[PDB]
Design a protein around this ligand. Structure first.
Ligand SMILES: [Zn+2]
Ligand SMILES: [Zn+2]
Ligand SMILES: [Zn+2]
Ligand SMILES: [Zn+2]
Length: 1237
RNA sequence: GGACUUAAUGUCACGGUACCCAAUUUUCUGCCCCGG
RNA sequence: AGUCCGGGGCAGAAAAUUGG
């Protein structure tokens, strides 16, 4: 008669499955999969929006479980009303079994038989079961049930609008992972809903009988499991943005930037990290300061207006959907615009086909025992960034079946990071399995309960979903798949990961309902705890091998309730299900009645199972690296934002303050753990020689076990490499510019200036890089010594951290070990040569021209069979070459980052004030300078090709067509490759030789130039861009060759006529800087790996040409500035085999049996005689230094200079076709020291 | 409240981490000669 | 035939943004 209506208060994302029909359930095994979940209904025939509900039989079963447990904990004394065990058996005559069996450990008593119960004085348990009711199972046909559990429809939130399924349910994927491997054994769909809006259900229950109210109310207040989540029970633009993306893609298409229709989309999606003002306040980075072209991508005129203003207008017209939801949507639209033109297994196992035993299994607790419960709550901090997976992007489509980018992180409808309950439960399962030492892998579909070692405690433990107290867009980490064959990027190798920020805190609960608190839980809770040394090791989440998902549970507080005497207080309070947020900050003085904290908790070093199989599983050892060279991490995509106009910037992490909200304003510069892993993997592969094989799917070599494979999870996992020595520089970030000098004109290419922007760092003050790497307790002695050798290879600087190693960036120079108990791995870790070759150089030993051309004909040889960049080869040499860079003439190397370094701009506005290159206040030399000069020298010596050529040019058109089809630059790696690029390295192939940064640390610091008018500096004559029109004027003449300058003491003229060139003419249109003195001792290194024997000698004596020959460096090369010669200190060589652990150097007997092989090989294309070769003689003639006589070399003037031209030999008489025809002009620029007079 | 949507003497889906391999990267001197 | 002429033109193109 009297009716009860109750509400369902959900405090965790529940589940719901399409109901279909009972007869149609067996058709869809997902139906029996979701019989314990909620249900969904469809109104129309077009699968339109409907309504959701939970079956009344489900809440009936929940009530039955609640009464069974409550009566079992009460020992059958429910306020003096005994209850019988009850009947759970069917098939009395012909079956008629209920739609759901039990297959559960039913709890009963010893006897529990006060009297025989019939349908006259039935027990309250009988009434709740309704065994003696007046209704059957076939159909209702009336309200004849003693107790009725009707539908539980929605709350008031379900207005008559017929809410869409998308607004209430979201598609999701649930996984399962085996122990020994790490691959997803099986995945299946799920429809995890939300508890924010549609988190309440209302249902009506009827109880015709009277002697059942107290137990029913106690059960209703005791149930804590409903649809798969906690519950509290009480009694009561896609079209306009699509068109815009199409328009902008078409505009970029006619803008010839067909390939560039993706890099702007990447940066636009990156804009969600930044605020509205990143595109609204003023603009994206402006770009070139004075080129009158703007930024190479953002200041581009699209549909008339600039791209930095067209998108601003778009934002102004689309402010409705906010910043994040507009930026992400526009990025997805751009991805779709580009992509419009450019198997796994499931396992549900919910069926009765296995068997039909369904045997009753009584389980009676022992008499006199005390059963308690424990709630473990705290904060789950993440000391490392965390990534959580999700189904394919934009493929969720809830309610239907059969952005688009990256591996999206899991976010709720609130659009913030969240740890799914299932992931935390699985991590706990794995950790408890490790603590036990043995168990059974989870196999679904089992009709009988799995009596595993760890499965027993799973029935008695529960935990809830966790959501961030933080809502910001996540950064997008970049990963590449570099081929070990060529150490570069191949097709289909880049992808994106949307990791979160480190330091974020999460709520975390662990409620255990068992007889006694197990020691394994008490050990794993300290294993996760962040103690003084443990620091937490909860590897919860995804990409655990890479280094993401190492949570450290913190601030653990213990509470326990009573189920034997204080059950009714638990019934009243319901265990604070959903109130754990207040429980986090609820102090010791505000505890409710009972619920004393569990005071039997022990310390970390007190439990046996912790020290047996919990902590030994991981042995973290932290090592600090110092680097004496600038470091660059290639964050180019993020460089298309923030002021600076720089095409290459370092990668910066993002951390969250502990105890303080929001991100610190200063980002943490760091090296990605992904590169930390890649360098180690490449090193171990090259030492083992197993890189470059077919695959590692079924392989079991030295690589698959240590670093994982397609099947098994990696047994080594790393962490982010962060820089700790940050606040000790005040100039931590240093700008360095790079150019690609044309080999035909001696100047910059048409469009090749690739400016960079790396960190700072000096050999006397290095960047302290700190990190850690984890080892599991299964590596044998050989593998441990192998990993120590892996560290030792970094100790010798073989592998450069960061990018652009071939210049000298990020050269490690030693690793130190901390005192975090690393003792497991701590224990395991003559005269310089000088060539005597002398060149005569008797072209004019007793008027010249500064730059000469080197014609070498059309004879070109290229090596089709490229030498792979795989594991080190024993016979091919590899090592370092220490050298002394000796300065003869003043050396002029400007730090072009600061155009006002000399602070002379105030006296002369608009005058460039360059400063000498220096890193962290110490004298340095750009590695790229030596790289380029030595590459030019080697290529000209080998006369192979033109490394950099200025194609598509007009000279007095088609300058690239005049050059014959044999000297073209290094094309793809199929038709051939330049021998000069075979060693130095062309595109899509890493060069084996990595140049270094020189550290002088000796000699006079400055060229004082006593008596000079300029103060603590000097001036220099303004230089003009080359005009190759006069170089190759005649159409009949084909092309000149390489451009080489001459060596002379021409700096004396500049140092003498300084006032006549800096004050008389060009008051502002001039460049000035500081130069070096003579006799400056230097030291720089030239590393290499896997070099052929015959190329090593060429490299060595092209480094040191010999006596009376020096290399040209710095500006003012036509003016004679910067004549320097480098002499080898000692050529080293290391042995791959561990037998020869110590490194060796070649004998100092003039480096015997090395250069002669290359000298002999050159004739195909005892002391060496390089003047017996037509082109080497000319090459060495141009580099001859006739000052260690004094020839004078200078540019002539057209008609009359401002101060000079003492007199003939001007640009008219020489330029006239009669007095000096152009036919002999090329001859005069090719023959060294021609007699122009 | 009937009506979309359940049977009732019996659901461990707290019976399952979208978990796994793939180094944002190699290559490039901040260089300098005459032409409407 | 009739005097001035320049001292800044490059300031990144080119290679991958999907495969088991
Ligand atoms: Zn009874
Ligand atoms: Zn088990
Ligand atoms: Zn293998
Ligand atoms: Zn080449």
């Amino acid at each position: 008669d009297m009716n009860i209506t109750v509400e369902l208060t959900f405090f965790e994302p529940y589940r719901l499955v399409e109901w279909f029909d009972w007869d149609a359930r067996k058709k869809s095994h997902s139906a029996m999969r979701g019989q314990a979940f909620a249900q969904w209904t469809w109104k129309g025939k077009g699968r339109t929006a409907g309504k959701s509900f939970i079956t009344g039989t489900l809440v009936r079963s929940a009530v039955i479980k609640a009464v069974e447990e409550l009566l079992s904990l009460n020992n059958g004394k429910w306020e003096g009303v005994p209850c019988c065990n009850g009947s759970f058996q069917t098939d009395e005559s012909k079956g008629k079994k209920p739609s759901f069996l039990r297959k559960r450990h039913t709890l009963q008593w010893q006897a529990n038989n006060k009297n025989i119960c019939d349908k006259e004085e039935a027990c309250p348990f009988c009434i709740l079961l309704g065994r003696f009711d007046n209704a059957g199972k076939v159909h209702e046909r009336n309200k004849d049930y003693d107790i009725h559990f009707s539908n539980f429809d929605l709350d008031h939130k379900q207005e008559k609008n017929d809410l869409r399924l998308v607004d209430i349910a979201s598609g999701r994927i649930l996984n399962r992972v085996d122990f020994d491997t790490g691959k997803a054994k099986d995945y299946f769909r799920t429809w995890e809903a939300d508890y924010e809006t549609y988190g309440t259900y209302t249902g009506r229950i009827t109880l015709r009988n009277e002697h059942a109210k107290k137990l029913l109310l106690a059960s209703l207040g005791f149930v804590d499991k409903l649809c798969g989540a906690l519950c509290r029970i009480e009694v009561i633009h896609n079209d306009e943005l699509r068109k815009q993306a199409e328009v902008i893609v078409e505009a970029f298409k006619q803008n010839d930037k067909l390939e560039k229709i993706r890099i702007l989309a990447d940066a636009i999606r990156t804009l969600r990290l930044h605020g509205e003002g990143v595109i609204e306040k003023d603009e994206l980075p402006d770009g070139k300061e004075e080129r009158d072209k703007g930024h190479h991508l953002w200041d581009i005129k699209v549909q008339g207006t600039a791209l930095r203003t067209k998108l601003k207008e778009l934002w102004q017209s689309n402010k409705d959907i906010g910043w994040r939801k507009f930026t992400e949507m526009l990025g997805s639209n751009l991805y779709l615009i580009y992509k419009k033109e450019t198997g796994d297994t499931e396992y549900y196992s919910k069926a009765h086909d296995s068997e039909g035993s369904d045997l009753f299994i009584p389980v009676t607790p022992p008499e006199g025992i005390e059963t308690k419960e424990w709630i473990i709550v705290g904060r789950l901090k993440a000391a490392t960034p965390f990534y959580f997976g999700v189904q394919q992007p934009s493929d969720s489509i809830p309610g239907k079946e059969k952005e688009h980018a990256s591996f999206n992180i899991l976010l709720d409808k609130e659009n913030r990071y969240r740890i799914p309950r299932s992931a935390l439960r699985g991590a706990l399962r794995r950790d408890l399995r490790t603590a036990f030492g043995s168990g059974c892998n989870v196999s679904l579909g089992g009709q009988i309960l799995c009596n595993c070692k760890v499965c027993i405690e799973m029935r008695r433990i529960t935990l809830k979903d966790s959501v961030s107290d933080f809502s910001e867009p996540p950064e997008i980490r970049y990963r590449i798949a570099k081929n070990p064959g060529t150490a570069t990027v191949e097709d289909g190798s880049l992808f994106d990961i949307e990791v979160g920020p480190e330091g974020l805190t999460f709520p975390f609960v662990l409620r255990y309902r068992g007889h006694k608190f197990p020691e394994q839980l008490s050990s794993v809770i300290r294993y996760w705890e962040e103690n003084d040394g443990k620091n937490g090791m909860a590897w919860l989440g995804g990409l655990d091998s890479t280094g993401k998902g190492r949570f450290a549970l913190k601030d653990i507080k213990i509470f326990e309730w009573d189920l034997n005497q204080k059950i009714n207080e638990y019934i009243k309070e319901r265990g604070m299900r959903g109130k754990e947020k207040e429980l986090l900050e609820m102090g010791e003085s505000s505890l409710p009645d009972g619920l004393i904290p569990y005071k039997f908790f022990e310390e970390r070093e007190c439990l046996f199972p912790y020290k047996e199989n919990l902590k030994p599983q991981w042995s973290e050892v932290q090592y600090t690296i110092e680097v004496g060279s600038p470091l660059l991490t290639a964050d180019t995509i993020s460089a298309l934002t923030e002021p600076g106009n720089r095409a290459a910037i370092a990668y910066k992490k993002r951390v969250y303050n502990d105890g303080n909200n929001a991100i610190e304003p200063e980002p943490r510069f760091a090296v990605k753990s992904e590169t930390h892993r890649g360098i180690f993997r490449t090193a171990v592969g090259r030492r083992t020689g197993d890189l470059g094989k077919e695959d590692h799917e079924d392989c079991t070599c030295d690589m698959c076990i240590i670093f994982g494979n397609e099947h098994e999870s990696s047994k080594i996992r790393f962490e982010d490499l962060e820089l700790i020595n940050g606040n000790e520089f005040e100039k931590l970030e240093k700008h360095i510019d790079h150019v690609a000098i044309d080999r035909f004109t001696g100047g910059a290419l048409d469009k090749a200036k690739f400016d960079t922007y790396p960190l700072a760092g000096s050999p006397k003050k290095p960047l302290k890089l700190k990190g850690r790497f984890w080892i599991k307790k299964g590596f044998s002695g050989d593998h441990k010594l192998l990993i120590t050798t892996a560290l030792s290879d970094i100790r010798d600087g073989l592998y450069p951290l960061g990018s652009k190693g071939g210049v000298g960036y990020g050269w490690v120079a030693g690793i130190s070990i901390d005192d975090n108990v690393p003792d497991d791995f701590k224990e395991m870790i003559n005269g310089p040569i000088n060539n005597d070759y002398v060149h005569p150089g008797h072209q004019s030993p007793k008027i010249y021209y500064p730059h000469y051309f080197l014609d070498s004909g059309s004879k070109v040889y290229r090596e089709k069979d490229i030498i792979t960049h795989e594991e080190f080869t024993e016979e091919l040499l590899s090592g370092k070459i220490n050298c002394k860079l000796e300065t003869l003439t003043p050396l002029i190397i400007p730090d072009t980052s600061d155009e006002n370094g000399l602070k002379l701009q105030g006296n002369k506005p608009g005058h460039k004030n360059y400063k000498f290159f220096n890193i962290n206040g110490e004298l340095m030399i750009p590695g790229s300078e030596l790289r380029g000069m030595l590459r030019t020298h080697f290529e000209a010596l080998t006369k192979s090709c033109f490394a950099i050529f200025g194609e598509d040019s007009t000279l007095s058109k088609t300058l690239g067509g005049k050059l014959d089809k044999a000297l073209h630059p290094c094309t793809g790696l199929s038709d051939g490759l330049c021998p000069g690029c075979h060693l130095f390295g062309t595109t899509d192939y890493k060069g084996r030789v990595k140049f270094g940064f020189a550290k002088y640390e000796n000699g006079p610091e400055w060229l004082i130039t006593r008596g000079n008018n300029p103060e603590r500096s000097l001036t220099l004559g303004v230089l003009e861009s080359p005009r190759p029109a006069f170089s190759i004027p005649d159409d009949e003449s084909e092309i000149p060759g390489r451009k080489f300058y001459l060596h002379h003491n021409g700096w004396r003229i500049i140092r003498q006529k300084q006032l006549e060139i800096r004050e008389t003419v060009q008051p502002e249109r001039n460049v000035t800087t500081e130069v070096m003195d003579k006799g400056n001792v230097f030291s720089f290194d030239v590393r290499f790996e896997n070099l052929r024997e015959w190329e090593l000698g060429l490299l060595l004596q092209s480094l040191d040409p010999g006596k009376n020959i020096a290399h040209k460096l710095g500006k003012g090369k036509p003016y004679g500035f910067g004549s320097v010669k480098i002499k080898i200190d000692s050529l080293h060589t290391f042995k791959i085999n561990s037998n020869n652990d110590k490194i060796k150097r070649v004998p100092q007997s003039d480096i015997r049996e090395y250069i002669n092989k290359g000298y002999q090989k050159l004739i195909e294309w005892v002391l060496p005689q390089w003047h017996v070769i037509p082109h080497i003689d000319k090459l060495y003639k141009l580099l001859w230094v006739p000052f260690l006589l004094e020839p004078d070399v200078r540019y002539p003037v057209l008609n009359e200079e401002s101060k000079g031209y003492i007199e003939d030999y001007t640009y008219k008489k020489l330029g006239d076709k009669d007095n000096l025809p152009y036919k002999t002009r090329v001859k005069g620029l090719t023959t060294p020291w021609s007699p122009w007079n």
